[PDB]
């Protein structure tokens, strides 16, 4: 039995993600980096290694949209996403299809087309989680920009995929979850994005998250780092652990940024680390070691249960 066979189809009940057999589910895994810049890792060898060695129960495909991404090169970037999705299906783990944009509402037809295609192809499959708008900017209003954009994309997904989870980004780089909680999308199996970087974001952002939970919505940490929000500097292992404590207490799923070999703190692997996986201890950065150790410790028993 695989992880996806264990938990099955996912849905949302109140503050929680639940599975079809009555489990309350918490996923943990890794995000790939921008598909147009780290596309060499968008392959089945990486996905298998993330399951077998890192004990990921979810992987996130971060499809770049602007800056020579999907809008300019739709076939190439969609292909990379589908390779990762296909591998997650073959290996029995969950997969997030992330529309990795800061301005999705500016090209809603492109986003609707992409998600319609993904939902038509994969709609009957329990592994799939959709993430329709990575990180709205500080200027991007929930009520006026994000919510109407997301509702249009959700309707398109739901033509073909009636119940898989859809995660919706929030204002200020997916920080301001209380604004979504005050005016939620009143549709089935919707969650809301929280992103944190513990060199920058500490108890004040945990308090924001708690206030959103108080208001009745479910959060998914589709991206977090171990360092400050720029992705470089202020490696913060103790603060990361305070976040893990909070997320585990609330059964909030989490994926780390990122599988990339860029020479910055947030990268999990060293420059030139193999595109096929197989990374030994000397191929991991301090951030990668911290995150991999947490995955092995917490997800190991889930794999062992089968």
Catalytic option among 77, 208, 223, 239: 223
Tokens of 292: 């991999």
CB 191 within 8 A of CB 227: no
- Which residues, listed in sequence order, are joined to residue 28 by a DSSP beta bridge? 254
| Residue linked to tokens 């108080």 | 214
Active site residue 239: no
Catalytic option among 135, 179, 208, 239: 135
CB 5 within 8 A of CB 20: no
Residue 26 region by backbone torsions, left for phi larger than 0, else alpha for psi between -120 and 50, else beta: beta
- What residue spans define the domains of the chain? 1-306
Q: Name the helix (H) or strand (E) containing 28.
A: strand 28-32
* Alpha-carbon gap, residue 220 to 191, rounded angstroms: 6
Distances (CA, A) of 134 to 1, 75, 121, 150, 273: 32, 20, 22, 11, 26
Active site residue 151: no
Under DSSP, the state recorded for 190 is E
* Alpha-carbon gap, residue 216 to 130, rounded angstroms: 21
Longest dimension (CA), the chain: 48
Tokens of 147: 């919510």
**Of the candidates 5, 69, 4, which has an alpha carbon nearest to the alpha carbon of residue 42?**
69
* Alpha-carbon gap, residue 157 to 168, rounded angstroms: 13
* Alpha-carbon gap, residue 111 to 75, rounded angstroms: 14
* Alpha-carbon gap, residue 105 to 140, rounded angstroms: 9
Sequence-distant (6+) residues with CB within 8 A of 77 are: 35, 36, 63, 64, 69, 70
* Alpha-carbon gap, residue 306 to 294, rounded angstroms: 20
* Alpha-carbon gap, residue 84 to 98, rounded angstroms: 12
Q: Which CATH number fits domain 1-306: 3.20.20.100, 3.40.50.970, 3.20.20.80, 1.10.357.10?
A: 3.20.20.80
């Amino acid at each position: 039995k695989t992880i996806v066979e264990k938990y099955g189809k996912l849905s949302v009940k109140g503050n929680y993600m639940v599975g079809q057999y009555g489990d309350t589910v918490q996923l943990r895994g890794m995000s790939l980096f921008w598909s147009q810049w780290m596309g060499q890792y968008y392959n089945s060898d990486v996905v298998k290694w993330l399951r077998d060695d890192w004990k990921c129960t979810v992987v996130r495909a971060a499809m770049g949209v602007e800056m020579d991404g999907y809008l300019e090169n739709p076939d190439t970037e969609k292909m990379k996403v589908m390779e990762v999705v296909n591998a997650a299906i073959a290996k029995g783990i969950y997969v997030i299809i992330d529309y990795h944009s800061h301005e999705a509402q500016k090209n809603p037809a492109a986003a609707q087309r992409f998600f319609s295609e993904m939902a038509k192809k994969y709609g009957n499959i329990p592994n799939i989680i959709y993430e329709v708008y990575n990180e709205p900017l500080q200027a991007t209003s929930w009520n006026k920009d994000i919510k109407p954009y997301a509702e249009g994309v959700i309707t398109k997904i739901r033509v073909y995929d009636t119940t898989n989870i859809i995660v919706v980004g929030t204002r200020q780089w997916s920080q301001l979850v209380t604004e979504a909680a005050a005016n939620p999308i009143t549709r089935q199996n919707i969650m809301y994005t929280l992103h944190f970087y513990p060199g920058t974001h500490k108890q004040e952002l945990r308090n924001e998250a708690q206030k959103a939970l108080d208001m009745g919505i479910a959060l998914f940490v589709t991206e977090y780092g171990t360092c400050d929000a720029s992705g470089n500097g202020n490696f913060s292992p103790e603060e990361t652990a305070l976040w893990y404590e909070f997320l585990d207490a609330h059964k909030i799923s989490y994926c780390n940024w990122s599988i990339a070999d860029k020479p910055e703190t947030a990268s999990a692997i060293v420059p030139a680390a193999s595109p096929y996986g197989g990374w030994a201890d000397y191929d991991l950065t301090p951030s990668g070691k911290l995150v991999r150790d947490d995955l092995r410790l917490k997800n190991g028993p889930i794999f062992d249960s089968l």
